Design a protein around this ligand. Structure first.
Ligand SMILES: [Mg+2]
Ligand SMILES: [Mg+2]
Ligand SMILES: [Mg+2]
Ligand SMILES: [Mg+2]
Ligand SMILES: [Mg+2]
Ligand SMILES: [Mg+2]
Ligand SMILES: [Mg+2]
Ligand SMILES: [Mg+2]
Ligand SMILES: [Mg+2]
Ligand SMILES: [Mg+2]
Ligand SMILES: [Mg+2]
Ligand SMILES: [Mg+2]
Ligand SMILES: [Mg+2]
Ligand SMILES: [Mg+2]
Ligand SMILES: [Mg+2]
Ligand SMILES: [Mg+2]
Ligand SMILES: [Mg+2]
Ligand SMILES: [Mg+2]
Ligand SMILES: [Mg+2]
Ligand SMILES: [Mg+2]
Ligand SMILES: [Mg+2]
Ligand SMILES: [Mg+2]
Ligand SMILES: [Mg+2]
Ligand SMILES: [Mg+2]
Ligand SMILES: [Mg+2]
Ligand SMILES: [Mg+2]
Ligand SMILES: [Mg+2]
Ligand SMILES: [Mg+2]
Ligand SMILES: [Mg+2]
Ligand SMILES: [Mg+2]
Ligand SMILES: [Mg+2]
Ligand SMILES: [Mg+2]
Ligand SMILES: [Mg+2]
Ligand SMILES: [Mg+2]
Ligand SMILES: [Mg+2]
Ligand SMILES: [Mg+2]
Ligand SMILES: [Mg+2]
Ligand SMILES: [Mg+2]
Ligand SMILES: [Mg+2]
Ligand SMILES: [Mg+2]
Ligand SMILES: [Mg+2]
Ligand SMILES: [Mg+2]
Ligand SMILES: [Mg+2]
Ligand SMILES: [Mg+2]
Ligand SMILES: [Mg+2]
Ligand SMILES: [Mg+2]
Ligand SMILES: [Mg+2]
Ligand SMILES: [Mg+2]
Ligand SMILES: [Mg+2]
Ligand SMILES: [Mg+2]
Ligand SMILES: [Mg+2]
Ligand SMILES: [Mg+2]
Ligand SMILES: [Mg+2]
Ligand SMILES: [Mg+2]
Ligand SMILES: [Mg+2]
Ligand SMILES: [Mg+2]
Ligand SMILES: [Mg+2]
Ligand SMILES: [Mg+2]
Ligand SMILES: [Mg+2]
Ligand SMILES: [Mg+2]
Ligand SMILES: [Mg+2]
Ligand SMILES: [Mg+2]
Ligand SMILES: [Mg+2]
Ligand SMILES: [Mg+2]
Ligand SMILES: [Mg+2]
Ligand SMILES: [Mg+2]
Ligand SMILES: [Mg+2]
Ligand SMILES: [Mg+2]
Ligand SMILES: [Mg+2]
Ligand SMILES: [Mg+2]
Ligand SMILES: [Mg+2]
Ligand SMILES: [Mg+2]
Ligand SMILES: [Mg+2]
Ligand SMILES: [Mg+2]
Ligand SMILES: [Mg+2]
Ligand SMILES: [Mg+2]
Ligand SMILES: [Mg+2]
Ligand SMILES: [Mg+2]
Ligand SMILES: [Mg+2]
Ligand SMILES: [Mg+2]
Ligand SMILES: [Mg+2]
Ligand SMILES: [Mg+2]
Ligand SMILES: [Mg+2]
Ligand SMILES: [Mg+2]
Ligand SMILES: [Mg+2]
Ligand SMILES: [Mg+2]
Ligand SMILES: [Mg+2]
Ligand SMILES: [Mg+2]
Ligand SMILES: [Mg+2]
Ligand SMILES: [Mg+2]
Ligand SMILES: [Mg+2]
Ligand SMILES: [Mg+2]
Ligand SMILES: [Mg+2]
Ligand SMILES: [Mg+2]
Ligand SMILES: [Mg+2]
Ligand SMILES: [Mg+2]
Ligand SMILES: [Mg+2]
Ligand SMILES: [Mg+2]
Ligand SMILES: [Mg+2]
Ligand SMILES: [Mg+2]
Ligand SMILES: [Mg+2]
Ligand SMILES: [Mg+2]
Ligand SMILES: [Mg+2]
Ligand SMILES: [Mg+2]
Ligand SMILES: [Mg+2]
Ligand SMILES: [Mg+2]
Ligand SMILES: [Mg+2]
Ligand SMILES: [Mg+2]
Ligand SMILES: [Mg+2]
Ligand SMILES: [Mg+2]
Ligand SMILES: [Mg+2]
Ligand SMILES: [Mg+2]
Ligand SMILES: [Mg+2]
Ligand SMILES: [Mg+2]
Ligand SMILES: [Mg+2]
Ligand SMILES: [Mg+2]
Ligand SMILES: [Mg+2]
Ligand SMILES: [Mg+2]
Ligand SMILES: [Mg+2]
Ligand SMILES: [Mg+2]
Ligand SMILES: [Mg+2]
Ligand SMILES: [Mg+2]
Ligand SMILES: [Mg+2]
Ligand SMILES: [Mg+2]
Ligand SMILES: [Mg+2]
Ligand SMILES: [Mg+2]
Ligand SMILES: [Mg+2]
Ligand SMILES: [Mg+2]
Ligand SMILES: [Mg+2]
Length: 204
RNA sequence: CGGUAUCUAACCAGAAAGCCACGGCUAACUACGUGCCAGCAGCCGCGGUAAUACGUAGGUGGCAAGCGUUGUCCGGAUUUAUUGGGCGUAAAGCGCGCGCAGGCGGUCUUUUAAGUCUGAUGUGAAAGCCCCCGGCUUAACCGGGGAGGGUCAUUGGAAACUGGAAGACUGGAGUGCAGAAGAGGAGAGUGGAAUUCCACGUGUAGCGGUGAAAUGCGUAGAUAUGUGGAGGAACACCAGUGGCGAAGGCGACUCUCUGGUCUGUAACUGACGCUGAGGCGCGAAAGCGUGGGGAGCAAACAGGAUUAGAUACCCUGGUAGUCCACGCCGUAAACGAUGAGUGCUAAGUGUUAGGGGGUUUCCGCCCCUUAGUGCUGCAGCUAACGCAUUAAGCACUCCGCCUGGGGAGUACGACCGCAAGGUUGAAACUCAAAGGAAUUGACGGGGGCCCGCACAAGCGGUGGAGCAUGUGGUUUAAUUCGAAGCAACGCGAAGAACCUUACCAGGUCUUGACAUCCUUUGACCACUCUGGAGACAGAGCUUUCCCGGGACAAAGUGACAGGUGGUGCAUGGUUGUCGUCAGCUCGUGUCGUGAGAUGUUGGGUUAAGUCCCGCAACGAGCGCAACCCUUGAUUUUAGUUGCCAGCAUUUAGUUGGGCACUCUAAAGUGACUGCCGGUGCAAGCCGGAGGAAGGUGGGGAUGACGUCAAAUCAUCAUGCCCCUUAUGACCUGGGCUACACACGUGCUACAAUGGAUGGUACAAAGGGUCGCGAAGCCGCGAGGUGGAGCCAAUCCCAUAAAACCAUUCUCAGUUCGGAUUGUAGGCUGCAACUCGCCUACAUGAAGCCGGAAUCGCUAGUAAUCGUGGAUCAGCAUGCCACGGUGAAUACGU
RNA sequence: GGAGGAAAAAUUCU
């Protein structure tokens, strides 16, 4: 049986959209400009541990917020990387772009970051069990109420693919006021392609 | 021996270290090379791209002038068990009995010293092991003394025990006396029920058989029924984990001849007993020889069926045999898978054959005891299942047997048999397992309970006809690819004339239609005309980067690009299905040698692992339920584009005016078996009140652990494998729409609850700026023209249709039905032939309610009538939503 | 729960 995307089940219920702008007659072009912005930002700040990007619009003016774990790489020594990004985004959109940076405290409590971590260990040939268990350990000692991870694919370069999952605490997926974060990332292996799924049930 | 041992002086760190191993057993790891190859190996086994096991290098461990390998012996091995094992199910109790030799043997007394125990004498050479002393500079080595070692000969002692002799006694054993029961065995005779065959009356067309049939018997007269006769085998009810026997085994009745057992007495003898190799005898069934008998059944055999085949199971027949007498054979899951004898060790409860006592007039009931036969259970034993006074417990005597699986109960030899074969019984070789009990799952062509529009009760359909659409098949240059029981088939496709397009024909291109960098130029593109089906070529006007940067831009060249090419069985991601089915586990305790178990089993109740009551468990978590959306009632806040009541106005809720009422949308309230009666220990169940609403009120979203190598390399991404002047790229035309046929899903009808004509009411939810498109005018109509109001609670789409009211038709293949075809037109589009949709006039096919069969649905549901939307220039009977009218039935598993 | 007797149904394959 299939499950519904836990984030999709909570958009508008207890969660919020990542694109907080309203438009009519200029909706498709705004949407695809936002998609291009997101892709270009994701391809530039790859190794900066970026957790979330949100975009807003108001009268020929694009505001971008980048929730990231370590702002020192994003916000440079005095504004080198930020201004390079802003100029490139200006040339990409032909608008006026203002870039705002915030820092994620307790970065082990965010699902995308831990999924990136597990994918990075798996790409570096670290046993899947070790990576999953250690990520669970750190996430739980960071103050979570529940963690669940699974890794699926040609595990260890075998001929037949399978999936293995581990958990600690509780993750109630059917409760609507439960605030589960969720992330899926791919690891690029010489044997194929591996998938890492992470559910984090926080206090809310 | 011999200038030998030994000793004295000078020089010298200089002339002197190797082997095996490093994953576990077992002490000691890193890198490189290789890639199921090279190879290692005592075993577990390592080698397929990250090798502490292969080779090497570094390091480490053990030993040392030695270190490894092989061969033989002992240990570990309790794996021949005297010390020191066993035989219910793992290998291991002869099928049973009678018994020679042998082994063992109740109690007491006297006597003997054969066994037993002990003292003395002689001897058990030297060397060797051992103890104490010594000698070589130590040690090895050597010497001295001592000790050890015998079922040893002579001889002296003791007499508890085993043995011998002489006596004595009954508990063992047997006889006597009195009763009891029994399918114990052999011989002869007899009885009834039933089957088969034969003869004769009545009677006519089938009988028999199977999952279905057929072979077969029958009109030459069956099957059926009544009467009589012949012959053979087996003994219904009684009948019972009842009885007898050593075992095999023994069921009708009567008689004759015979074996064994139990209880009662204490009369009699006085250990006369147990076991028992070799011998002798009995021994289910099948089989053999001779002679009878032969009704049923039935190996072999034949025919009919089933099956792909059917040397079988099933059906119709049928010979040996089953029966009797005599003689062989000597086997079995011959089993309680448990050898015989003796004694000891909690209880409860049936039954068979006896004995004693108490109650009681008898009957009967109660207690005690002997010998059998069942069940439940304590200690104890067992790996566990389990056994447990009928031991698999505790002990002793005697016999038989076992030592990893296969080869094999086989070969050679021997004995027995008429034969079939029986008894005794190996080895080479090969494997590292074979096996017993129990546990958690997964299956079964095993079972029980419970639920679901699964069946039942109903309503409407499908299968019949015409058309629309998908699939198979066939055809074709191509008819592009994918989906294949349920879970493929109005499916991907929420729009195939061109494009989409991946397919085919013909015409063209090669760093390229699409990306980064390179080298020169920097704005190239757009436009006109000529040729061409078009892609493309040929001339002119031509290209205006900005501030060396950058993205664009033309030329030439690579590095490269480009694949809807294959593998969904190498994958990520997404989905179907069981199924919104009710499950999946954990913590702490207890029970088990252990893996494990309990909670989670049992009885009720629920939609539900929902809850209650029990119970060695007490709780919790993910799944159920709740939180989210919508609908039904209502309060406050807010009145425009919504509403109009009381007021003036108008073709008009129009204009003025007002939020009263509907309405709109934010926040609350409200339903919880909350209260009442009954029932129940409780959960719960049946009714009642109030309330808009009553039993999770109606409906959504929500899909746990797992199943199907399920679907998708063609949405995307991706390992590996393929093409690269082509499997890439551009164009015009065609095809995906073919048509003897079969299937799936739908639409329209077969008419009077109806057709035609006229009149006339009542919705909801949605869409609209390169868009919706009003009024008016023109047209028979599809439509044209016109341009108002709208970025919308305002304007437009927008006529709702069934329903209702009048007139007509009057049961007719028709004034039903609309396919099919002829002509003339309308729109969109460059273009409507293949191949769009719509209109007018003409034409007027099948079709009379649909066979075997099959589908949906439990209430605002089914049935029926319209409306809107996505895709979309145009195109839906499909899909997704909206309202109008609005049922029947559910006894039950 | 244990022991004894005992009916009726029955196609082939995966
Ligand atoms: Mg599902
Ligand atoms: Mg999802
Ligand atoms: Mg998910
Ligand atoms: Mg997967
Ligand atoms: Mg000399
Ligand atoms: Mg000398
Ligand atoms: Mg000198
Ligand atoms: Mg010198
Ligand atoms: Mg020297
Ligand atoms: Mg020196
Ligand atoms: Mg030296
Ligand atoms: Mg040396
Ligand atoms: Mg090595
Ligand atoms: Mg070395
Ligand atoms: Mg060394
Ligand atoms: Mg030994
Ligand atoms: Mg043994
Ligand atoms: Mg024994
Ligand atoms: Mg055995
Ligand atoms: Mg026996
Ligand atoms: Mg035997
Ligand atoms: Mg015997
Ligand atoms: Mg004897
Ligand atoms: Mg004696
Ligand atoms: Mg000596
Ligand atoms: Mg000597
Ligand atoms: Mg000395
Ligand atoms: Mg010596
Ligand atoms: Mg000596
Ligand atoms: Mg001596
Ligand atoms: Mg000694
Ligand atoms: Mg004496
Ligand atoms: Mg006696
Ligand atoms: Mg007759
Ligand atoms: Mg006497
Ligand atoms: Mg014998
Ligand atoms: Mg016989
Ligand atoms: Mg005979
Ligand atoms: Mg037969
Ligand atoms: Mg035998
Ligand atoms: Mg036996
Ligand atoms: Mg015994
Ligand atoms: Mg008894
Ligand atoms: Mg018992
Ligand atoms: Mg035993
Ligand atoms: Mg086994
Ligand atoms: Mg089992
Ligand atoms: Mg189960
Ligand atoms: Mg079953
Ligand atoms: Mg069902
Ligand atoms: Mg039903
Ligand atoms: Mg149904
Ligand atoms: Mg029915
Ligand atoms: Mg019907
Ligand atoms: Mg129907
Ligand atoms: Mg219908
Ligand atoms: Mg049909
Ligand atoms: Mg048909
Ligand atoms: Mg038809
Ligand atoms: Mg039809
Ligand atoms: Mg039609
Ligand atoms: Mg159609
Ligand atoms: Mg076809
Ligand atoms: Mg052809
Ligand atoms: Mg072809
Ligand atoms: Mg096809
Ligand atoms: Mg495919
Ligand atoms: Mg379904
Ligand atoms: Mg289907
Ligand atoms: Mg359908
Ligand atoms: Mg089609
Ligand atoms: Mg074309
Ligand atoms: Mg490629
Ligand atoms: Mg492959
Ligand atoms: Mg495939
Ligand atoms: Mg896959
Ligand atoms: Mg699959
Ligand atoms: Mg496949
Ligand atoms: Mg898959
Ligand atoms: Mg396959
Ligand atoms: Mg299931
Ligand atoms: Mg299950
Ligand atoms: Mg369970
Ligand atoms: Mg149980
Ligand atoms: Mg629960
Ligand atoms: Mg729920
Ligand atoms: Mg309302
Ligand atoms: Mg009520
Ligand atoms: Mg609800
Ligand atoms: Mg497959
Ligand atoms: Mg399937
Ligand atoms: Mg399939
Ligand atoms: Mg396939
Ligand atoms: Mg590919
Ligand atoms: Mg792809
Ligand atoms: Mg596909
Ligand atoms: Mg494909
Ligand atoms: Mg596609
Ligand atoms: Mg339909
Ligand atoms: Mg219809
Ligand atoms: Mg008509
Ligand atoms: Mg009318
Ligand atoms: Mg109306
Ligand atoms: Mg409306
Ligand atoms: Mg529209
Ligand atoms: Mg309309
Ligand atoms: Mg309308
Ligand atoms: Mg007609
Ligand atoms: Mg026509
Ligand atoms: Mg046409
Ligand atoms: Mg056309
Ligand atoms: Mg006409
Ligand atoms: Mg005609
Ligand atoms: Mg006709
Ligand atoms: Mg008629
Ligand atoms: Mg049905
Ligand atoms: Mg229902
Ligand atoms: Mg309808
Ligand atoms: Mg109609
Ligand atoms: Mg309609
Ligand atoms: Mg309709
Ligand atoms: Mg409509
Ligand atoms: Mg429509
Ligand atoms: Mg349209
Ligand atoms: Mg339709
Ligand atoms: Mg149409
Ligand atoms: Mg319809
Ligand atoms: Mg029902
Ligand atoms: Mg029974």
């Amino acid at each position: 049986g299939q499950k519904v995307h836990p984030i999709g089940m909570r958009i508008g219920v207890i969660r919020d959209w990542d694109s907080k702008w309203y438009a009519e007659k200029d909706y498709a072009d705004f949407l695809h400009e936002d998609l291009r912005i997101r892709d270009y930002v994701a391809k530039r700040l790859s190794d900066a541990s970026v957790s979330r990007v949100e975009i807003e619009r108001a009268a020929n003016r694009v505001n971008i917020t980048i929730h990231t774990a370590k702002p020192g790489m994003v916000i440079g020594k005095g504004g080198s990387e930020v201004e390079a990004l802003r100029k490139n985004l200006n040339e990409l959109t032909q608008k006026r772009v203002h870039i705002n940076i915030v820092e994620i405290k307790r970065a082990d409590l965010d699902a995308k970051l831990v999924a990136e971590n597990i994918a990075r260990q798996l790409e570096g040939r670290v046993s899947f069990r070790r990576a999953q268990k250690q990520a669970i350990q750190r996430t739980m000692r960071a103050g979570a109420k529940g963690i669940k991870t699974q890794v699926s694919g040609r595990l260890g370069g075998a001929d037949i693919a399978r999936a293995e999952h581990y958990s600690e605490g509780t993750v109630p997926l059917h409760t609507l006021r439960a605030d589960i974060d969720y992330a899926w990332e791919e690891a690029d292996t010489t044997y194929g392609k591996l998938g890492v799924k992470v559910w984090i049930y926080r206090g809310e």
